[PDB]
Design a protein around this ligand. Structure first.
Ligand SMILES: N[C@@H](Cc1ccccc1)C(=O)O
Ligand SMILES: N[C@@H](Cc1ccccc1)C(=O)O
Lengths: 279, 281
């Protein structure tokens, strides 16, 4: 029985929460303190899906999908890209002149340095960004401001003094949607975008990765993610996490994968899912 | 600037990062910093001569995004370090196992030590930092409070280690890189010494583009031990790669591979040339 819950790591109002609401508006987000807990909610049947961030353009917190996903009995059934924006929020009726300190995650402060220095404020560490909004609403100190996603302003009843105050623009986080059941996207018939995510092992010897990539190179398969991971503590063998643009039933991918299987061990397809238009 | 003999690390005194600083640079004075960025900035401003930064951990622990930070800093890798990660159950001096009710640690640490919390009927309690949990236990002086922390924190806070190496899974290793503001390359090996070269390069996001860039390493016997993709900007037009190879840029084989890499890439930047840990053998 489907519980209609989608787990994420963090507090209510976070960017992960925004991703759940944007892509699955009719679902009920389920906050979890850690990524592992967000995975575990799907394994136990508490949540139908999990929304897990894996890439962020400006060195943000992302889950080690290469470690967690292969240990799960789970599959990637979608992806999502959310542009990240920060909002300067205060208690209702608090004026700009009253603010002395701005509370956010220590990492968030460094991405919003321009407005903190231009206004002469002191950035203050907070355990969690959405928690910073929660903290301001709970402490009820008018001098304390928070930097949080737009969603946290509405949830915690805080006023947004300034919009999109982040230093850099074009800050995007990539999520993957996880499920316990193996759902593959249908083979494209009219040039639709499909992503296949898989892992494989090679020996840690020269050209071993080269051998594994040979089939995609000569079959015109575009690879869009590739991360190395040395197995155990030793340097004897290496596992790779990879995304390709293609469906496993396509002849070109079938040929690349067959060549990959001769040169590697333990090839596991972790998902076959629709790709975002940003590609 | 003036050499301060300080090495910055992210965390509180007694952390695993501090352990790496003391093991590898015993005569330096570790300089705690609340964030990785602050540990970088300590080197940029001259507060610290070196920075000890974790970049790989076997069980999904917290590491700095070296691929983002190091290319934007003007810093170099001048060393690496591999530290086996272990947790110690520590208590106030003379406290008996029967007295403990709560175990305090970082939430990720509690998640790696579930067996000893369950076997003894204790309640794990969240703490912001693992070494901080040891500090908290020594300060509160509540005999019922135990901590899970690195061995170093026990010596610093005068705590008794009730049980050793209590973590669930073994083979938990963290890889650090040693950073510097000034460039220094290890000398070219003459007798099969271990040397690592770390670099970034960009290719177009089209089929076979990475394949071309690796071609030179493949046919010259250059072993690559790390490779990470990073799609540039918001678009999917170009991709940056972070890579470690075992070799020195003056060796003929590496010279040829890098030359072939330069024909097939843009913006090749060598980020460091440093001695490799014996763990590579
Ligand atoms: N060392 C192997 C596999 C490998 C490549 C890149 C990074 C990590 C491992 C090779 O050079 O082909
Ligand atoms: N997309 C390019 C480069 C690339 C490879 C792997 C991961 C990311 C980018 C290729 O197929 O060669």
């Amino acid at each position: 029985m489907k519980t209609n819950r989608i787990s994420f790591q963090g507090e209510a109002g976070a960017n992960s929460d925004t991703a759940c609401r944007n892509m699955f508006p009719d679902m009920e987000p389920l906050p979890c303190p850690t990524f592992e807990d967000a995975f575990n909610a799907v394994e136990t049947g508490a949540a139908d899906l999990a929304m897990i961030p894996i890439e962020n353009t400006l060195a943000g917190r992302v889950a080690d999908i290469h470690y967690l996903l292969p240990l799960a009995d789970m599959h990637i059934v979608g992806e999502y890209f959310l542009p990240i924006h920060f909002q300067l929020m205060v208690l209702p009726g608090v004026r700009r002149e009253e603010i002395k300190t701005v509370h956010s995650h220590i990492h968030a402060l460094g991405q919003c340095r321009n407005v903190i220095r231009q206004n002469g404020w002191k950035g203050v560490i907070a355990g969690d960004t959405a928690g910073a909004a929660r903290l301001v609403a709970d402490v009820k100190d008018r001098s304390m401001a928070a930097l949080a996603p737009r969603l946290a302003a509405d949830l915690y009843g805080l006023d947004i003094l300034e919009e999109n105050v982040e230093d850099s623009e074009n800050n995007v986080t990539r999520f993957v949607v996880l499920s316990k059941n193996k759902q593959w996207a249908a083979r494209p018939e009219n040039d639709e975008r499909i992503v296949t995510t898989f892992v494989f092992r090679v020996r840690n010897v020269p050209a071993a990765l080269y051998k594994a990539l040979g089939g995609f190179a000569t079959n015109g398969v575009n690879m869009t993610k590739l991360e190395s991971y040395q197995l155990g503590g030793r340097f004897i063998a290496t596992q790779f996490y990879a995304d390709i643009e293609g469906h496993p039933e396509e002849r070109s991918v079938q040929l690349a994968l067959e060549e990959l299987r001769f040169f590697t061990k333990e090839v596991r397809i972790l998902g076959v899912y629709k790709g975002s238009d940003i590609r």
